[PDB]
Amino acid sequence: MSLRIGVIGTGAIGKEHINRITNKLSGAEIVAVTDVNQEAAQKVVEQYQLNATVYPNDDSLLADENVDAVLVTSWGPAHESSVLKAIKAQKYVFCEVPLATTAEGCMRIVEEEIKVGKRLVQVGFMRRYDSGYVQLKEALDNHVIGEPLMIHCAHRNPTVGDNYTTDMAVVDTLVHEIDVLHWLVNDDYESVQVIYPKKSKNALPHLKDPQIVVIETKGGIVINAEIYVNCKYGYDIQCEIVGEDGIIKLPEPSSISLRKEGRFSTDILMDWQRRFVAAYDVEIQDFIDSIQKKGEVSGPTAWDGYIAAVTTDACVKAQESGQKEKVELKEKPEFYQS
Amino acid sequence: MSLRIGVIGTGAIGKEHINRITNKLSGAEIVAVTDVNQEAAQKVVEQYQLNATVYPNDDSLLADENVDAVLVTSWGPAHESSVLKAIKAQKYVFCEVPLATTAEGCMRIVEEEIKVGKRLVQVGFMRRYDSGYVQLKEALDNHVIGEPLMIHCAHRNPTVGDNYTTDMAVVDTLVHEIDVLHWLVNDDYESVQVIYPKKSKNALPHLKDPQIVVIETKGGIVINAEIYVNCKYGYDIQCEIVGEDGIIKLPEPSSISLRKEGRFSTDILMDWQRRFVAAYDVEIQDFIDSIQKKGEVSGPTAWDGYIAAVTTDACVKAQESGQKEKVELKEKPEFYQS
Amino acid sequence: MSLRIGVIGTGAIGKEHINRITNKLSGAEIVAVTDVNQEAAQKVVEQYQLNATVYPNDDSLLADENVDAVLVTSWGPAHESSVLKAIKAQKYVFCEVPLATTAEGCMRIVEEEIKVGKRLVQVGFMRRYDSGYVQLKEALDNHVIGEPLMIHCAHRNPTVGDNYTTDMAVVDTLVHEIDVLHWLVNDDYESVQVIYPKKSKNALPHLKDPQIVVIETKGGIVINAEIYVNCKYGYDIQCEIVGEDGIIKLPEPSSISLRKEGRFSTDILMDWQRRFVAAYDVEIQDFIDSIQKKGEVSGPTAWDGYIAAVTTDACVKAQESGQKEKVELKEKPEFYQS
Amino acid sequence: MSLRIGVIGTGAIGKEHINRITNKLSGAEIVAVTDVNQEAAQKVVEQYQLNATVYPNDDSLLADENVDAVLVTSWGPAHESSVLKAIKAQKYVFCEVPLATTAEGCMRIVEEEIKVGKRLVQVGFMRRYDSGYVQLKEALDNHVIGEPLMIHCAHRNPTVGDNYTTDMAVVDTLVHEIDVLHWLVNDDYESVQVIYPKKSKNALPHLKDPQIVVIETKGGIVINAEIYVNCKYGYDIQCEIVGEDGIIKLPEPSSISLRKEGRFSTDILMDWQRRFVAAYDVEIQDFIDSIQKKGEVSGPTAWDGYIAAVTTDACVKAQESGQKEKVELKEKPEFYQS
């Protein structure tokens, strides 16, 4: 029996997930949609040739007893409301980043989920499903390099639009690093500090770019995360983990090599949408498969969403203060302990 | 509407394809199976929880008007018979390598398909769907290196069983190179010659390993293909194409790097079944999608199967003779021209 | 006419330079030596078969009118005294690191040299002559990456002895990075801060290792320098410079690659004495050649020694304080301006 | 005491060696020169400020009892005559490639040297002193990959002049591979065969380029050597040795890496004169040092010159015949056995 999925929010993000579920992945079907703009939802049902009911809002969609699970892919600030409604309707939910805009919002979700007795919520941190990050996690789990001590990472983007602001470097961009790193080393964040190098000619007058975020974990791991969103040369993710006895490093995306006109070279991606395509497929397939096999979801958790929200807020605070800011995290509930 | 697929031959190969269709890919369902050993087919239906009819033979399966397409994954020498039956029953067919065991067998299939007026047969040369080979093809199509002049490639395997014989290096192993290279450079083979270096200590007394196959295309491209099936260190595919003005090269499979105990290193796969997993998925998804969108298949063709059979026979002849042997190919029909 | 060189200090360092001058390089001869322990100097004259006078002290050696130039390779704290004596005797001088132990000591040398009207002093920062660093400097001079914005570097060592202390990570080890970086980007240091990750199991109880030093230049370049002197895996120098429009990176020392037992790998050096052998040769040959061609030396200057001493002191201060410490540098004299 | 060296032939090659001996290396001096054009020799003495006697011919230079050793850097076909004269005058001799133009000429030299009772002749195959080739030799000597089975190598050049002819690809260019490979694997050549791919647009009508030379050793190692002298992209030497249990490969010349405009890249040299600069220095320093320490030379031998001459002749024969040609080598004398 195919998992029957309703989609809340049919913009670009929702459309891509609908496409993968309908045309690429196994074991599920889109049976319902809703968008703030009903005309857009109807258009999407036609665009993708869905056998799907269009609902005026998420309450009515969630009341459809033929809906087993939902994707929350609406406007970012609206995610939290739908997640809470889904947990109350006892439906599984895949929520695109962010889970909620504040630590308090994530806590509301956490408290409601912990009542359910099983995991309903998976948050869309797709990097955990990227084959490179999976290999890193495997090496760490096997103690290949001894205790991790330091992490050097970078998130670089060729250019950004006029609307991209300083806070977004952490809130929209670094949030992915924020999730993946504490997962990799099984250690929680203690503090963050932001340092601004000289501003790049490639950045608009209002934007502070590049920036360096220094994050320390409770166990003493020191992370220096470079964010440079106008680096011109490409879209580029780098991550190196220095352990006691060795060093592991995320690979480049696969590319044929070229010898030509005095250079030996490989491609660097220009389009961020080409970097993690496979991970988005695998994360949604895991959502489907875990529900079918286990009756509960298995990816990044509501708690991970909480960690990200708390840490993002602290980074933005540090962007403004110039001081080292504490990351104040509640103790992780046994409900979320591996 | 899902494509309704029948499977002819439910051994290890058939089981893997059934698994991908049922659990990984989109747009198709296994509705029927048959195996020489009916008990094995029944077991597979139960193993994979299929809603599928077990037929005693391929004729009865092909007579099921609810079957739209078939996979031919039986014993190698039996492939040809099922392919011919499917073409006569006017069903689309995906045939695992080889299409047929002789040039004449492939010609029988070709002559029958060319009557149909559309392409029914796709042959399982999965390498054409590997992202690395796709990148190579793109560079060549874009004339990045000018005219290809020479190709240096290698197919290496850690060790083989007692039953692996000299002819199999070409028939089972090099056949994949044989298909992919002429596709890459759009040029047909003219001659082959086999040279034996000193025998490896890692090979059994009966096996000639390693070997070098030199293949020349009608256009004058010279290919030197190394086959070494007891190389001990890993499973390894290498391909470098030297053009007039530059050189392109297939990448290593993606791997984190490690600095440890005086070495900077990446993984080499040990298991050949881990090398092309993604390509098998993509090739079958293409079979499904092309039938749905175009009403005809789009992968390697019956003609490609013919080329492989003719070329494999010539290589085996050269293994025995020590001389340069002609690859005698009929002119490619307009039916198969891009 | 060969340059006639006297050596002040015939320990291990002095012996290596004597060896290169006598057995490897062109245009100079060792005509005189002195060591605190006369017996050791005499032994060295015999060991290397020198036609050289043994002097009881540097004053008597410097009074030898057949001495054109001196190497100062004595005990570190004793360097300054010999350098001042040589400048007064108007002899060219190559001084091993450090020029002097304090900013004030380097200033004494600077003030005396600036009177001479030509450059007499070259300081032994050999990295500027390493082919990799030379390539980096060339790219930067040619504006290949636009303005440098950030530098990520590392100085790693397999293990250290019981006597190696926390301050030495900066004074003995990072001093080389300290010299090379400001030279690369033509920008002076403004501040330093030290951050301690969790201590490595590989470090002795008294040693803080690893450490991260964050250095900001007056122009706004941010440098994060990792020092890890018990990394176990090898001796390893890494340097990446992120500019506005691209990124350049120091290469690995040259090594054949190996495919074996499931790994594709290159060597990492274990012995720090194998990393910069060529640079030591080239730096001394430059000392010889510049004196012969220009009548003045051309390498790292007394001023560079001053920068290093001031910066090293500030790092050690920051190691203790945990705060960001200012690097207070006098304005660079026109005497030292390119 | 410096080794007193006379130079026979003061063209471009002789001038470079004179420069390295006079300005770069240790332990020797140029005390005499001769060139067919006396005016050119005199000019060179002035150009390099030598304290050197100009002799009208090699006989008079060799009669100078203050000459300890000679370099033979004259016109290629004239090398043999000077080498024989030097052996008769009992002087050490460094001979640029080729030792002689025919197997018979090399044999004349061999027979005369074997009378001397010690090695006088070193042939200028500088690749044996390149750090990459030295590393390859070390791995092989240590049995890192088990028995060598196959070698894949390439000698590529960006473009050649109008005067460059088909035979020169082997005689001038591949001769270096010819020397280095049999040295690497300690195995002598048995046969050669030449195969011509389609001609490159980059080659002139008279030149066959590229070409592939297949060489088999007596022990059964199979070598495929690609020569492509109009490859446009750079000057490039590649060498991969496939052994029973692993594979070793010559590294790229060291280069910083660059991320810029969608590419991650390293430099490829354009100028062949930049590839082996260090090896030329080391080979001449070895000539000097071995004579001083051992009273006999230690590099590539007169016998190696013989092997090269015999093998080059066989390659040129195969270029013309299209058949596999024998490499007919006399048994190596105990005089030349390690």
DSSP per residue, A199-243: PPTTS-TT---SEEEEEEETT--EEEEEEETT-SS--EEEEEEEE
For residue D49, count other CB atoms closer than 10 A to its CB.
9
DSSP annotation of A173 reads I
In D166-288, DSSP assigns E strands to 189-195, 211-217, 222-228, 236-243, 246-249, 257-260, 263-267
For residue A47, count other CB atoms closer than 10 A to its CB.
13
CA distances from B236 to A53, B224, B233, C264, D276 (A): 50, 16, 9, 11, 32
The span from the CA of D159 to the CA of D232, in Å, is: 6
Which residues from B are below 8 Å from D195, CB to CB? 214, 216, 222
Q: How was this structure determined?
A: X-ray
CB contact (8 A) between residue A198 and residue C210: no
Structure tokens at B137: 């093809």
C72 bridge partner residues: C8, C95
DSSP annotation of C323 reads S
Location of structure tokens 């194409």: B241
| CA-closest candidate to residue B31, choices B57, B7, B59, B63 | B7
The span from the CA of C182 to the CA of A98, in Å, is: 42
B92 bridge partner residues: B69
State phi, psi for D81 to the nearest 5 degrees. -60, -45
Pairing assessment for the beta strands A69-72 and A3-8 based on DSSP bridges: parallel
For residue A76, count other CB atoms closer than 10 A to its CB.
16
The span from the CA of D153 to the CA of B224, in Å, is: 12
Cα dihedral A211, C155, D256, A134 sign:
negative
Report the amino acid identity of residue A332.
K
State phi, psi for C211 to the nearest 5 degrees. -145, 160
Q: Which strands form C53-54's sheet, in the order they lie side by side?
A: C53-54, C28-34, C3-8, C69-72, C92-95, C121-123
State phi, psi for B300 to the nearest 5 degrees. -55, 145
* C259, C262, C270 ranked by CB distance to B262: nearest: C270
The span from the CA of A28 to the CA of A21, in Å, is: 7
Q: What number of CA atoms fall less than 13 Å from residue C90's CA on the CB side?
A: 6
CB contact (8 A) between residue C264 and residue B261: no
Cα dihedral B39, B41, B42, B46 sign:
positive
Contact A228, A209 (CB under 8 A): yes
Which residues from B are below 8 Å from D196, CB to CB? 220, 222
Interface residue ranges in chain D relative to chain A, Cβ cutoff 8 Å: 232-234, 236, 252, 259-270
Neighbours of D (≥3 Cβ pairs closer than 8 A)?
A: A, B, C
Q: Please, where are the H alpha helices in A24-119?
A: 38-47, 58-62, 79-88, 103-116
The span from the CA of A96 to the CA of A99, in Å, is: 7
With a CB cutoff of 8 Å and minimum separation 6, the contacts of A84 are A108, A109, A112
Nearest-Cα residue of chain D relative to residue C258: D248
With a CB cutoff of 8 Å and minimum separation 6, the contacts of D154 are D225, D226, D227, D228, D236, D237, D238, D239
CB contact (8 A) between residue B231 and residue D245: yes
State phi, psi for C153 to the nearest 5 degrees. -135, 165
The span from the CA of C242 to the CA of C264, in Å, is: 28
State phi, psi for C325 to the nearest 5 degrees. -110, 140
Interface residue ranges in chain A relative to chain C, Cβ cutoff 8 Å: 146-147, 149-150, 152, 195-202, 210, 212, 214, 216, 219-222, 224, 226, 228, 231-233, 242, 244-247
| CA-closest candidate to residue A161, choices A197, A209, A195 | A209
Which residues from B are below 8 Å from D197, CB to CB? 149-150, 216, 220-222
Nearest-Cα residue of chain B relative to residue A20: B26
Q: Which strands form A3-8's sheet, in the order they lie side by side?
A: A53-54, A28-34, A3-8, A69-72, A92-95, A121-123
For residue A15, count other CB atoms closer than 10 A to its CB.
18
For residue D292, the surrounding DSSP H or E stretch is: helix D277-294
Pairing assessment for the beta strands D28-34 and D53-54 based on DSSP bridges: parallel
| CA-closest candidate to residue B121, choices B190, B169, B78, B70 | B70
D243 bridge partner residues: D148
In chain B, DSSP assigns E strands to 3-8, 28-34, 53-54, 69-72, 92-95, 121-123, 148-156, 189-195, 211-217, 222-228, 236-243, 246-249, 257-260, 263-267, 325-326
The span from the CA of B92 to the CA of C207, in Å, is: 71
Q: How far is CA D280 from the centre of its chain?
A: 10
With a CB cutoff of 8 Å and minimum separation 6, the contacts of A143 are none
Pairing assessment for the beta strands B263-267 and B325-326 based on DSSP bridges: unpaired
Which residues from C are below 8 Å from D145, CB to CB? 258, 260
Structure tokens at B274: 């881990």
CA-based nearest distance B223→chain D, Å: 9
Q: Please, where are the H alpha helices in B72-204?
A: 79-88, 103-116, 131-141, 168, 175-185
Nearest-Cα residue of chain C relative to residue B265: C265
Contact D90, D16 (CB under 8 A): no
Neighbours of C (≥3 Cβ pairs closer than 8 A)?
A: A, B, D
CB contact (8 A) between residue A246 and residue B257: no
* Sequence-distant contacts of A293-299: CB under 8 A, at least 24 apart: A295/A118, A296/A92, A296/A118, A296/A119, A296/A120, A297/A92, A297/A94, A297/A119, A297/A120, A297/A121, A297/A122, A298/A119, A298/A122, A299/A122, A299/A123, A299/A125, A299/A128, A299/A129
* A26, A248, A251 ranked by CB distance to B254: nearest: A251
| CA-closest candidate to residue B121, choices B145, B105, B133 | B105
B55 bridge partner residues: none
Q: How far apart are the first and last CA of chain D?
A: 29
Contact A85, A74 (CB under 8 A): no
Q: What is the number of residues in chain A?
A: 338
DSSP annotation of B51 reads -
**CA-based radius of gyration for chain A:** 21
CA-based nearest distance C159→chain B, Å: 12
**CA-based radius of gyration for chain B:** 21
The span from the CA of B188 to the CA of B181, in Å, is: 9
* C232, C236, C259 ranked by CB distance to B268: nearest: C259
Nearest-Cα residue of chain D relative to residue B153: D152
CA-based nearest distance A261→chain D, Å: 4
Which domains, and CATH codes, for chain B? 1-143+267-338 (3.40.50.720), 144-266 (3.30.360.10)
Breaks (C-N over 2.5 A) in chain A follow: none
CB contact (8 A) between residue C261 and residue D250: no
* D232, D233, D261 ranked by CB distance to A233: nearest: D261
Q: What number of CA atoms fall less than 13 Å from residue C316's CA on the CB side?
A: 18
CB contact (8 A) between residue D257 and residue C245: no
Contact A244, C200 (CB under 8 A): yes
Contact C260, D144 (CB under 8 A): yes
CB contact (8 A) between residue B232 and residue D245: yes
Cα dihedral D178, D184, D185, D187 sign:
positive
The span from the CA of A159 to the CA of A170, in Å, is: 16
Select from D247, D252, D264 the residue whose CB has the most chain B CBs within 10 Å, as the one to mutate to test that interface. D247
The span from the CA of C52 to the CA of A147, in Å, is: 54
With a CB cutoff of 8 Å and minimum separation 6, the contacts of B297 are B92, B94, B119, B120, B121, B122, B287, B290, B291
CB contact (8 A) between residue D201 and residue B147: yes
Cα dihedral B315, B321, B322, B328 sign:
negative
**CA-based radius of gyration for chain C:** 21
CB contact (8 A) between residue B267 and residue C267: no
Nearest-Cα residue of chain B relative to residue C262: B268
Nearest-Cα residue of chain D relative to residue B201: D244
Select from D49, D180, D249, D256 the residue whose CB has the most chain C CBs within 10 Å, as the one to mutate to test that interface. D256
CA-based nearest distance B323→chain A, Å: 34
| CA-closest candidate to residue B123, choices B109, B140, B137, B135 | B109
| CA-closest candidate to residue C221, choices C145, C167, C170 | C145
Structure tokens at D205: 């009508």
* B23, B248, B257 ranked by CB distance to A258: nearest: B248
Select from A145, A149, A202 the residue whose CB has the most chain C CBs within 10 Å, as the one to mutate to test that interface. A149
Nearest-Cα residue of chain B relative to residue D247: B233
* C150, C195, C219 ranked by CB distance to A212: nearest: C150
Contact A60, A89 (CB under 8 A): no
Location of structure tokens 């806590």: A107
Structure tokens at D225: 């050597």
The span from the CA of A248 to the CA of A337, in Å, is: 26
Which residues from B are below 8 Å from A247, CB to CB? 258-260
Which residues from D are below 8 Å from A234, CB to CB? 259, 262
| CA-closest candidate to residue C24, choices C238, C291, C244, C278 | C278
* Sequence-distant contacts of A133-139: CB under 8 A, at least 24 apart: A133/A180, A133/A184, A133/A239, A133/A250, A135/A251, A135/B255, A135/B256, A136/A184, A136/A239, A136/A241, A136/A248, A136/A250, A136/B256, A137/A183, A137/A184, A139/A248, A139/B256, A139/B258
The span from the CA of A130 to the CA of A120, in Å, is: 22
The span from the CA of C295 to the CA of A197, in Å, is: 41
C51 bridge partner residues: none
CB contacts < 8 A (A, D): 48
* D198, D214, D245 ranked by CB distance to B219: nearest: D198
* H helices, E strands: number in chain D: 10, 15
The span from the CA of A257 to the CA of B247, in Å, is: 8
| CA-closest candidate to residue C22, choices C55, C43, C44 | C44
Report the amino acid identity of residue C85.
K
The span from the CA of D235 to the CA of A142, in Å, is: 44
CB contact (8 A) between residue C149 and residue A224: no
Q: What number of CA atoms fall less than 13 Å from residue B152's CA on the CB side?
A: 18
CB contact (8 A) between residue B254 and residue A131: yes
CA-based nearest distance D6→chain C, Å: 18
CB contacts < 8 A (A, B): 82
With a CB cutoff of 8 Å and minimum separation 6, the contacts of D218 are D187, D188, D189, D190
Structure tokens at B158: 């850690």
The span from the CA of A56 to the CA of D117, in Å, is: 103
With a CB cutoff of 8 Å and minimum separation 6, the contacts of A88 are A112
CB contact (8 A) between residue D259 and residue C246: yes
Contact A62, A72 (CB under 8 A): no
Q: How far is CA C107 from the centre of its chain?
A: 18
Which residues from A are below 8 Å from D257, CB to CB? none
CA-based nearest distance D245→chain B, Å: 5
With a CB cutoff of 8 Å and minimum separation 6, the contacts of C3 are C27, C28, C29, C68, C69, C288, C291, C292
Contact A121, A306 (CB under 8 A): no
Q: Is A142 exposed, middle or buried (0-12, 13-18, 19+ CB in 10 A)?
A: exposed
The span from the CA of B147 to the CA of B39, in Å, is: 54
Contact C285, D26 (CB under 8 A): no
Contact A123, A306 (CB under 8 A): no
Q: What is the number of residues in chain B?
A: 338
The span from the CA of A71 to the CA of A94, in Å, is: 5
Location of structure tokens 């990520």: C152
With a CB cutoff of 8 Å and minimum separation 6, the contacts of C242 are A210, A226, A228, A231, C145, C148, C149, C150, C151, C152
Cα dihedral B133, B135, B141, B143 sign:
negative
Q: How far is CA C24 from the centre of its chain?
A: 21
Q: How far is CA D66 from the centre of its chain?
A: 28
Which residues from C are below 8 Å from A147, CB to CB? 198, 200-201
Contact C153, C180 (CB under 8 A): no
| CA-closest candidate to residue B74, choices B92, B54, B58 | B58
Angle between helix B38-47 and B12-23 (nearest 10): 30
Which residues from A are below 8 Å from D263, CB to CB? 263, 265-268
The span from the CA of D92 to the CA of D122, in Å, is: 8
The span from the CA of A71 to the CA of C303, in Å, is: 64
* D22, D139, D257 ranked by CB distance to C249: nearest: D257
C213 bridge partner residues: C194, C225
DSSP assignment string, C209-236: -SEEEEEEETT--EEEEEEETT-SS--E
| CA-closest candidate to residue B215, choices B310, B301, B305 | B310
| CA-closest candidate to residue D224, choices D179, D193, D186 | D193
